[PDB]
Design an enzyme around this catalytic site. Sequence first.
Site, PDB file in Angstrom:
ATOM      1  N   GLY A 185       0.809  -1.224   0.000  1.00 45.60           N
ATOM      2  CA  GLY A 185       0.000   0.000   0.000  1.00 45.60           C
ATOM      3  C   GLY A 185       0.840   1.270   0.000  1.00 45.60           C
ATOM      4  O   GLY A 185       2.010   1.260  -0.417  1.00 45.60           O
ATOM      5  N   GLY A 235       3.633   1.724   3.209  1.00 48.72           N
ATOM      6  CA  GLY A 235       4.604   0.626   3.085  1.00 48.72           C
ATOM      7  C   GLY A 235       3.970  -0.721   2.767  1.00 48.72           C
ATOM      8  O   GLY A 235       2.891  -0.772   2.185  1.00 48.72           O
ATOM      9  N   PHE A 238      -6.899  -9.292  10.945  1.00 49.15           N
ATOM     10  CA  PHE A 238      -6.740  -9.930   9.658  1.00 49.15           C
ATOM     11  C   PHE A 238      -8.106 -10.342   9.092  1.00 49.15           C
ATOM     12  O   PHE A 238      -8.888 -10.962   9.795  1.00 49.15           O
ATOM     13  CB  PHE A 238      -5.819 -11.166   9.744  1.00 49.15           C
ATOM     14  CG  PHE A 238      -5.596 -11.819   8.473  1.00 49.15           C
ATOM     15  CD1 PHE A 238      -4.749 -11.262   7.539  1.00 49.15           C
ATOM     16  CD2 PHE A 238      -6.274 -12.964   8.139  1.00 49.15           C
ATOM     17  CE1 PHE A 238      -4.585 -11.825   6.321  1.00 49.15           C
ATOM     18  CE2 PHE A 238      -6.132 -13.527   6.899  1.00 49.15           C
ATOM     19  CZ  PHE A 238      -5.263 -12.978   5.996  1.00 49.15           C
ATOM     20  N   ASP A 290     -10.877  -9.284   0.034  1.00 48.64           N
ATOM     21  CA  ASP A 290     -11.304  -7.894  -0.191  1.00 48.64           C
ATOM     22  C   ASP A 290     -12.370  -7.835  -1.290  1.00 48.64           C
ATOM     23  O   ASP A 290     -12.521  -8.785  -2.067  1.00 48.64           O
ATOM     24  CB  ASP A 290     -10.127  -7.030  -0.528  1.00 48.64           C
ATOM     25  CG  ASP A 290      -9.492  -7.376  -1.898  1.00 48.64           C
ATOM     26  OD1 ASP A 290     -10.153  -7.470  -2.941  1.00 48.64           O
ATOM     27  OD2 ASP A 290      -8.309  -7.584  -1.892  1.00 48.64           O
ATOM     28  N   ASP A 337      -9.210   7.655   0.809  1.00 46.71           N
ATOM     29  CA  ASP A 337      -8.768   6.783  -0.260  1.00 46.71           C
ATOM     30  C   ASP A 337      -9.530   5.471  -0.328  1.00 46.71           C
ATOM     31  O   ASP A 337      -8.943   4.369  -0.393  1.00 46.71           O
ATOM     32  CB  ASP A 337      -7.253   6.531  -0.141  1.00 46.71           C
ATOM     33  CG  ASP A 337      -6.648   6.051  -1.457  1.00 46.71           C
ATOM     34  OD1 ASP A 337      -7.231   6.255  -2.572  1.00 46.71           O
ATOM     35  OD2 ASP A 337      -5.612   5.390  -1.346  1.00 46.71           O
TER      36      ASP A 337
HETATM   37  O1  LIG Z   1      -4.185  -1.293   6.273  1.00 50.18           O
HETATM   38  C1  LIG Z   1      -4.451  -2.402   5.817  1.00 50.18           C
HETATM   39  C2  LIG Z   1      -4.226  -2.700   4.457  1.00 50.18           C
HETATM   40  C3  LIG Z   1      -4.476  -4.012   3.970  1.00 50.18           C
HETATM   41  C4  LIG Z   1      -4.331  -4.432   2.596  1.00 50.18           C
HETATM   42  N1  LIG Z   1      -3.966  -3.377   1.635  1.00 50.18           N
HETATM   43  C5  LIG Z   1      -5.142  -2.662   1.200  1.00 50.18           C
HETATM   44  C6  LIG Z   1      -4.814  -1.656   0.054  1.00 50.18           C
HETATM   45  O2  LIG Z   1      -4.069  -2.335  -0.914  1.00 50.18           O
HETATM   46  C7  LIG Z   1      -2.864  -2.964  -0.358  1.00 50.18           C
HETATM   47  C8  LIG Z   1      -3.326  -4.062   0.504  1.00 50.18           C
HETATM   48  C9  LIG Z   1      -5.060  -4.934   4.904  1.00 50.18           C
HETATM   49  C10 LIG Z   1      -5.383  -6.254   4.546  1.00 50.18           C
HETATM   50  C11 LIG Z   1      -5.968  -7.143   5.454  1.00 50.18           C
HETATM   51  C12 LIG Z   1      -6.212  -6.717   6.761  1.00 50.18           C
HETATM   52  O3  LIG Z   1      -6.790  -7.545   7.623  1.00 50.18           O
HETATM   53  C13 LIG Z   1      -5.884  -5.455   7.170  1.00 50.18           C
HETATM   54  C14 LIG Z   1      -5.318  -4.574   6.233  1.00 50.18           C
HETATM   55  O4  LIG Z   1      -5.008  -3.329   6.663  1.00 50.18           O
END
Ligand SMILES: O=c1cc(CN2CCOCC2)c2ccc(O)cc2o1
Length: 268
Positions: free
Chosen positions: A12, A13, A66, A70, A111
């Site tokens: 996204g 770091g 987690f 998505d 965003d």
């Molecule tokens: O901040 C975040 C960002 C992500 C994934 N990014 C979203 C944008 O694209 C890059 C991947 C994420 C995935 C699973 C999760 O449980 C928590 C998460 O928290």
Amino acid sequence: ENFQKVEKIGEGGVVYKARNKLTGEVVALKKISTAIREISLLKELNHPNIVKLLDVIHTLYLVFEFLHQDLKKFMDASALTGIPLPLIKSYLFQLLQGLAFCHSHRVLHRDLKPQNLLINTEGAIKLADFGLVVTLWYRAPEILLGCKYYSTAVDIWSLGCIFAEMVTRRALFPGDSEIDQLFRIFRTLGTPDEVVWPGVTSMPDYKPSFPKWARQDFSKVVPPLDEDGRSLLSQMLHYDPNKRISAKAALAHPFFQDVTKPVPHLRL
Ligand SMILES: O=c1cc(CN2CCOCC2)c2ccc(O)cc2o1
């Protein structure tokens, strides 16, 4: 160090799926002073449709709840058939609750996109990856026109673009530069002017030389969405951010009179 990396989820770091070696918990680990204090206030922003920030570790790693899938992946998986309307409506309604909550605490996402909307097996959808190739497809026109002091309304626009995309299975405004994003919006909604958006001609990047497209009729934009849905969508995509519907007011819209909570079919 209390964390074993399992898998790279995304950059996204960088975001890793990780396991906490003292709790057993599996988390999303994002590896990245005024900011350490801001970020630390966000551990308190807690709601069922916001991904939980579990821990902030400065030794800067942000440790998130987690979720396995998505909305972008789910839309690609649903592409032959489309997401069923009751599930679109359930996701829309849940995201609006999440936003109303953030917005009532003066927190903007900034965003929103399908990639940062996370879903689980129970039918929940959650806001992730708040903003404190770049994709411009969900950016509000006030941001594209260089407004520095934009509002909660930017998130309502993003979400309207996502709603349209769930319905049609196509991106609403798939621009590949700021100007192409803006012209794609103008080609569909009409070039804005001072009648529909007072003050528009004063935005930092507004040019009088923009081409003047006429508005398309919405029935062309998101067929076969019913009139309740098209009405809500038109209010979310209002040019003037002061007229754009709030998350709170959208939750009272007639479109949600029969909302339910279906469960999706997920392959993890
Ligand atoms: O901040 C975040 C960002 C992500 C994934 N990014 C979203 C944008 O694209 C890059 C991947 C994420 C995935 C699973 C999760 O449980 C928590 C998460 O928290």
